[PDB]
Design a protein around this ligand. Structure first.
Ligand SMILES: [Mg+2]
Ligand SMILES: [Mg+2]
Ligand SMILES: [Zn+2]
Lengths: 153, 52, 190, 205, 196
RNA sequence: UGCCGACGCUCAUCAGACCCCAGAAAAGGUGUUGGUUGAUAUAGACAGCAGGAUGGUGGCCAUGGAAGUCGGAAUCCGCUAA
């Protein structure tokens, strides 16, 4: 009896207050028993919230990972994570090139909810500076490069 | 204790009203001006407070 | 400024026979006869059209207040046509929390007695307007039905019986009890 | 604490300033006269709105401060703290007098100083707000809110000048580009054709 | 701005009416762009979809009545909520796959059910709840072991039956959506040909 | 003026009615009348009856936490009929 659940996760680090209990409620799995695996199977993120989906069978779980749109940008931009205090000035002050955005373009090409290659670079390069980051500059530098000098295959 | 489709009838006729801030007149919900002469037909209106 | 002419128009169906004595409109059809007098409006009413299919209301040299009364007459005559052809039915529910509103009908629908409203020992006797018949209906739990030809008399009797069951010196937002008008319509459908 | 403003409303006496004869005057209630982004250049706040008196009366310094505080606090909420410049163009110089009744009556009844009011004529600008052209209705609403702190009647007028200057806004950019006007911080300097030519060479070089 | 987009709609009509002269008109009835984008992903290499003002649509094509006399009958056949989808390739495969790509939409209060809808025997997944909203219409259901477990199939709404909000919360809680509202085809255009 | 006076304005359940002068203000009114200015309207407008308001995003900010809504710098993209 397959029954998937949509659950948002925190990362490889263990949180304090649990909110994953009622969705795993009706089939009856232990919360920390599945919470150790939901962090250890994920592993790589460790610092930021990510939707790690939970596809549970009739007996045991499957830990599948569905990355978000800009969470992969935060993952690619390698800020060293501090402790769980969420201290001041943990802003994203780093440099991103034009090759760390085409992987999201090919991913969302493979998942097929987008325009063509200009469109699927146009969402993520537009939303790269939405957080407060810069791809060596602000959003005015992605309207010049797409016109007659793009990276369209 | 009560039925909801019968409840909204009584809330329509009793509490879904506008109150004039100047003379406390009970007005229809789509009111922009009070109908009373003694407040000068003012536009200073508020909704009637919902009971908790 | 005074507009030279303002006219509006009522299209009368073939089931209705209409006649006029100056500004006194008489309407006769399947359910009865209605008479309304309009000597306080000071307009010109014309029953043109052969077999009298169409009625025309004129205001000559009128200001903004006087031009508002034209479609008022055109709505009143349409209400009389609607009430002589299809009639008027005011279906109304009684809402209570604890004490059931006991409604009984006397003198063939011309008087309505209300008992046990908010647990009171007082009996509310509501006279009805002449031409309006009130009855406890079926297929619904606590609902009264008012019948008539005149929308004025039917809705005024509905207002009388609604204001009869009112809550004194309490929060009426909490004590949502009474007899309230639910639906306004006709006797038979169209 | 003090008398109502209906007593000292009309310009009845001769002007009675703070001087070497009238000493002992208490301090005026308004001391800050212009505020906001007053350290702003000319070409970025082109729209100017005036509150203009329609009466010949006296406006108290307490009313001036109460009006400019309200105008500031609306314009900060509306357009941000650094998107305007409010300048009160009325300074309280007339000194009104108080004759205390502690019983000598009217014997030697010349008043000690009580407060300061500003003598205002018909057509005289009370406050001026300069900002960008997009904040026109906010200036109108801010001056309309500040009208309620004043006695009498005031009007609201959007000026045809460029900001806090005396030159028309339709010709201001052309007159700047022809180098007949030079930006000088808040306002501009007009350059005539009457000086020595060594300043013209420094201008055009 | 509307003044420039109003001129941009005419070029979009003008340079595409000469492209695809095979126009199967669909009806956008209470549909969202979240459902439109799901259509637009499969419909890229074959057909293009468009929405706009129907009067401005009546204005754009009546400037083509002189130099394209094959577009005469489109003005009596654009009434109501009408959008375009433009196709060149085939007339049968766009019948096949447009009726294939469907996502479920939630129930409403005043939306007809065009066929017979059954409620199969399936557990609700929730324990003790409002049991007075199950026998009101006539559904037989015994509260067995706390959790509400329904028994049999009850025809809640047949064809020619007006619906209300009395059967909406029980569908919303159990995620039972009866009908998927889709782009139904109203008119057929193949170079002048009209079909039902 | 018992002129077949002229043109308008005004309804007051506190109308108004003639220098000094014998009683009123700020602020208001979708009462009504006249103006000034700015929009959009057959490439079909204001009403009036539905869908949809989300992807980034649960934005970063400051917090015990504020997730399009309790503060403040900001205020950019896609798909687009939106
Ligand atoms: Mg009490
Ligand atoms: Mg004097
Ligand atoms: Zn009032």
């Amino acid at each position: 009896e397959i029954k998937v659940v949509y659950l948002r996760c925190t990362g490889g680090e263990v949180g304090a207050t649990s909110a994953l209990a009622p969705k795993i409620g009706p089939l009856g799995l232990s919360p920390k028993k599945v919470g150790d695996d939901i962090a250890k199977a994920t592993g790589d993120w460790k610092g930021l919230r990510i939707t790690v989906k939970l596809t549970i069978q009739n007996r045991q779980a499957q830990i599948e990972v569905v990355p978000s749109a800009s969470a992969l940008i935060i993952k690619a931009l390698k800020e060293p994570p501090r402790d769980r205090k969420k201290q001041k000035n943990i802003k994203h002050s780093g440099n991103i090139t034009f090759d760390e955005i085409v992987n999201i373009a090919r991913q969302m090409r493979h998942r097929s909810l987008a325009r063509e290659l200009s469109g699927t670079i146009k969402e993520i390069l537009g939303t790269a500076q939405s957080v407060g980051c810069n791809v060596d500059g602000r959003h005015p530098h992605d309207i010049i490069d797409d016109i007659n000098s793009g990276a369209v295959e | 204790i009560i039925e909801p489709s019968l409840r909204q009838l009584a809330q329509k006729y009793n509490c879904d009203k506008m109150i004039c801030r100047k003379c406390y007149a009970r007005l229809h919900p789509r009111a922009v001006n009070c109908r009373k002469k003694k407040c000068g037909h003012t536009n200073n209106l508020r909704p009637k407070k919902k009971v908790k | 400024m005074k507009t030279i002419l303002s006219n509006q128009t009522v299209d009368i169906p073939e089931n209705v026979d209409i006649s006029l004595k100056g500004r006194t409109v008489i309407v006769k059809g399947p359910r009865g006869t209605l008479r309304r007098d309009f000597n306080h409006i000071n307009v010109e009413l014309s029953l043109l059209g052969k077999k009298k299919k169409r009625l025309r209301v004129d205001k000559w040299w009128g200001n903004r207040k006087e031009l508002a009364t034209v479609r008022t007459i055109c709505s009143h005559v349409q209400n009389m046509i609607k009430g002589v052809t299809l009639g008027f039915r005011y279906k109304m529910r009684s809402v209570y929390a604890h004490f059931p509103i006991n409604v009984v009908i006397q003198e063939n629908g011309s008087l309505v007695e209300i008992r046990n409203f908010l647990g009171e020992k007082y009996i509310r006797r509501v006279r009805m307007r002449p031409g309006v018949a009130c009855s406890v209906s079926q297929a619904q739990k606590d609902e009264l039905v008012l019948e008539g030809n005149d929308i004025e008399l039917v809705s005024n009797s509905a207002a009388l019986i609604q204001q009869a069951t009112t809550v004194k010196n309490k929060d009426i937002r909490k004590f949502l009890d009474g007899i309230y008008v639910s639906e306004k319509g006709t006797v038979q459908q169209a | 604490g003090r008398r109502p403003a209906r007593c000292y409303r009309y310009c009845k006496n001769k002007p009675y300033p703070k001087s070497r004869f009238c000493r002992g005057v208490p301090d005026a209630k308004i001391r800050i006269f212009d505020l906001g982004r007053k350290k702003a250049k000319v070409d970025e706040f082109p729209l100017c709105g005036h509150m203009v008196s329609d009466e010949y009366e006296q406006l108290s310094s307490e009313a001036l401060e109460a009006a400019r505080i309200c105008a500031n606090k609306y314009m900060v909420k509306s357009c941000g703290k650094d998107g305007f410049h409010i300048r009160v163009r009325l300074h309280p110089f007339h000194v009104i007098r108080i004759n205390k009744m502690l019983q000598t009556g009217m014997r030697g009844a010349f008043g000690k100083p009580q407060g300061t009011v500003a003598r205002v004529h018909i057509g005289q600008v009370i406050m001026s707000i300069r900002t960008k052209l997009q904040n026109k209705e906010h200036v109108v609403e801010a001056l309309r809110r500040a009208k309620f702190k004043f006695p009498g009647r005031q009007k609201i007028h959007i000026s045809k000048k460029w900001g806090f200057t005396k030159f028309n806004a339709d010709e201001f950019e052309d007159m700047v580009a022809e180098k007949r006007l030079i930006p000088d911080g808040c306002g501009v300097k007009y350059i005539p054709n009457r000086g020595p030519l060594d300043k013209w060479r420094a201008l055009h070089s | 701005d509307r003044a420039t987009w109003k001129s941009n709609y005419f070029l979009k009509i003008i340079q595409l009416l000469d492209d695809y002269p095979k126009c199967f008109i669909v009806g956008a009835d209470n549909v969202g762009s979240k459902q439109m984008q799901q259509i637009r992903m499969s419909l890229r290499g074959k057909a293009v979809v468009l929405m706009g003002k129907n009067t401005m649509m009546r204005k754009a094509i009546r400037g083509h009545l002189e130099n394209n006399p094959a577009l005469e009958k489109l003005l009596p056949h654009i009434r109501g909520n009408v959008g375009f989808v433009f196709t060149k390739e085939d007339l049968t495969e766009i019948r096949d796959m447009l009726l294939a790509n469907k996502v479920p939409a939630a129930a409403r209060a005043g939306a007809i059910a065009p066929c017979e809808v059954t409620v199969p025997a399936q557990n609700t997944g929730l324990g003790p709840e409002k049991t007075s909203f199950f026998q009101a219409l006539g559904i037989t259901t015994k509260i067995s072991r706390g959790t509400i477990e329904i028994l049999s199939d009850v025809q809640l709404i047949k064809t020619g039956d007006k619906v209300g909000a009395s059967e909406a919360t029980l569908l919303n809680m159990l995620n039972i959506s009866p009908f998927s509202f889709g782009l139904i085809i109203q008119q057929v255009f193949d170079n002048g040909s009209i079909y039902n």
